[PDB]
Scaffold this active site. Structure first.
Site: not given
Ligand SMILES: CC(C)(COP(=O)(O)OP(=O)(O)OC[C@H]1O[C@@H](n2cnc3c(N)ncnc32)[C@H](O)[C@@H]1OP(=O)(O)O)[C@@H](O)C(=O)NCCC(=O)NCCS
Ligand SMILES: CC(C)(COP(=O)(O)OP(=O)(O)OC[C@H]1O[C@@H](n2cnc3c(N)ncnc32)[C@H](O)[C@@H]1OP(=O)(O)O)[C@@H](O)C(=O)NCCC(=O)NCCS
Ligand SMILES: CC(C)(COP(=O)(O)OP(=O)(O)OC[C@H]1O[C@@H](n2cnc3c(N)ncnc32)[C@H](O)[C@@H]1OP(=O)(O)O)[C@@H](O)C(=O)NCCC(=O)NCCS
Lengths: 237, 237, 237
Positions: A151, A207
């Site tokens: 996640t 666990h």
């Molecule tokens: C589908 C998903 C997981 C894809 O993640 P992703 O591969 O990192 O892709 P994204 O298009 O969202 O990333 C946008 C940008 O932010 C960056 N980024 C994403 N997550 C990051 C993090 N944890 N820390 C720093 N940078 C991050 C990426 O590298 C990308 O950077 P760039 O535009 O400079 O290349 C995402 O869009 C998503 O839905 N995230 C939320 C997940 C969620 O709901 N989890 C529950 C707890 S919040």
């Protein structure tokens, strides 16, 4: 105040999570990863990766690939517990669910047999499963059979979180916000303070399947993999 | 995939922890400790402690001794709640369970009447109870009557964790991985950045017995005790 | 050992929290806030605020005001879920409960219609509700109708904690101990290490009402509000 009925995605997600906590023994192990080397590799590789594979190269596939390798070397984590028969099942396939934030709620589409995929195939699968989950174009098979979940908790800037795992899964790994931090580095016994791109990597484990020392060994394999950042042949540019 | 039945240690540990969370109100208070002074004392004292007491001097007995003193000055933490009679029992003895990672699973052997032991007797008891738990040579009395637990979560490099307490116990203290960090020190109003050997000290407590402010006072006594590092007469070398 | 029956405050608090965890899907999102600008504003404003409003100006009303504004711009957080009818109720009023540590146990008196109050009226309401809760002079209406809770976990020095929310509430925000830390600042692409007065701001949320991305957006609004520290007209000195 106003009231509206929630959609079936939010209704089922909420119920599955309330139940998940009552039938498991969840803990959240906290680890951190120095993502600076991956950040530098990603910056220089993004134009070539977009041209060859058609997707934007983010940190998530690095974490997914390292987790998939660690689920193969730590098969005790890619496992499920049956409290009735008191049996452990170590799963042959690594079916990694990816948490996707959609307009209709959280969806966790599964990358089946992720141990058989290349790093670019994983990056393309994340983009494909996320686009279809956001457009609510997923097949039922796409949400079944997960053995582990990753996640991206850092998408909305969280330093960390305590993700909820859903049995029969035994672990859920969080990729929290990568932030610049003042951290100690050591070289030939010289401790010094550097500015590094760090992130917390919370790992919630049951666990019933994984003990604390197992959780520690599991995240140490992933931490070392990402910090070494030997992903040039994986990027295949 | 392959299936095998878990041993009785893992079966009972898992069931006790699933049940523990359903009958208690657990929270994990997060505190940190500057272990640098203890690390320096330990380095210079290890050869003399090995010769006089026959054991390797680690950080764990420092934490156990400080916890035992704090359980005597905070008797509200060395206590149990009865939800049926709505009564609190403040225990006279401090029976500290030590989480031991064994090849057969987690075991928590108890140091009974730890308030009556010297620092070297605690260090020797940890080594003795751990060796017997790893060899599965424990008597049944060795696993009964715990009033508190100390878990070395840092053994496999965890920054922190949210340990599960098991009622009737009211608290479980974690000794997470001691790592070098950039931290602020102050001397005569001069704030400056030092490299210190720090560790997170998560403390999971049951709100049925201990409230948040009580948890804070409890860990502040332990934090101050370890940071002052006045253990020369305790080492008795 | 000695036994005594707990008072009704501790008996009911304990039972409500054991039950709260079984009927909700709680997670603790971790965020941090740079409170240095507020600390400087507070230091210079304390004499004038004491003379005009009659109370000691602390950090808590800054957090409460920022939370109240964020509960109005994120009405999805000022909401409750009904698992039987599968309905969400977004509450019109922002009734903020304030966790008060009293000699008789934890009490959470409610600031009703906090969205209609000025910053000084919030500071005065906290002092008034806390004084009455410590003197056990609260009316029954003072403990009913909370839509959100703010808990000062930093009062006894906790770095962080995982506060327990109590349904029908969907979130509880913690204001952990403000401590000086080595943190990275950036100005015109220049990363540098500064000593800043930071605090962790854990936010426990119910996945039945708020998903992880919603929790992140919610704490980002509060974090930006406090870090900008534009509270001069709010102080109205
Ligand atoms: C589908 C998903 C997981 C894809 O993640 P992703 O591969 O990192 O892709 P994204 O298009 O969202 O990333 C946008 C940008 O932010 C960056 N980024 C994403 N997550 C990051 C993090 N944890 N820390 C720093 N940078 C991050 C990426 O590298 C990308 O950077 P760039 O535009 O400079 O290349 C995402 O869009 C998503 O839905 N995230 C939320 C997940 C969620 O709901 N989890 C529950 C707890 S919040
Ligand atoms: C029985 C046990 C608790 C004894 O702990 P111990 O007294 O520290 O002894 P060990 O022999 O394991 O210590 C090995 C070394 O690592 C060091 N060490 C251990 N824990 C440490 C920590 N948290 N941070 C830094 N160093 C640590 C010790 O000081 C010792 O160092 P040295 O060889 O330089 O003298 C331990 O072996 C164990 O089983 N730990 C795991 C507990 C567990 O399973 N908890 C559950 C959550 S993971
Ligand atoms: C009622 C209550 C919330 C009021 O909080 P408050 O507005 O900060 O007021 P207090 O009188 O307690 O503050 C004492 C001082 O410590 C400071 N302080 C309080 N909390 C702080 C924190 N988290 N970090 C740093 N400083 C803090 C205040 O600014 C004030 O400073 P000053 O004397 O220099 O002006 C508080 O007294 C209380 O009961 N806290 C405990 C809440 C609780 O039990 N939560 C459960 C989890 S611990």
């Amino acid at each position: 105040g106003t009231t509206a009925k929630v959609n079936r995605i939010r209704e089922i997600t909420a119920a599955k999570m309330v139940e998940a906590l009552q039938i498991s023994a969840q803990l959240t192990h906290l680890q951190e990863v120095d993502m600076t080397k991956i950040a530098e590799l990603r910056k220089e590789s993004k134009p070539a990766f977009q041209q060859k594979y058609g997707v934007n190269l983010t940190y998530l596939p690095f974490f997914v690939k390292a987790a998939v390798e660690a689920l193969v070397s730590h098969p005790n984590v890619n496992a499920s517990y049956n409290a009735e028969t008191k049996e452990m099942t170590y799963h042959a396939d690594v079916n990694v669910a990816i948490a996707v934030d959609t307009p209709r709620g959280l969806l966790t589409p599964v990358i089946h047999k992720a141990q058989e995929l290349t790093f670019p195939e994983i990056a393309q699968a994340i983009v494909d499963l996320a686009d279809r989950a956001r457009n609510n174009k997923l097949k039922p098979q796409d949400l079944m059979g997960a053995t582990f979940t990753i996640t991206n908790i850092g998408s909305e800037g969280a330093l960390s979180d305590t993700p909820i795992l859903v049995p029969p899964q035994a672990g859920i790994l969080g990729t929290a916000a990568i932030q610049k931090r003042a951290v100690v580095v050591t070289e030939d016994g010289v401790d010094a303070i550097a500015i590094r791109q760090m992130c917390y990597m919370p790992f919630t484990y049951d666990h019933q399947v994984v003990d604390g020392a197992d959780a520690g060994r599991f995240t140490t394999t992933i931490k070392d993999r990402l910090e070494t950042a030997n992903f040039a042949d994986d990027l295949a540019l």
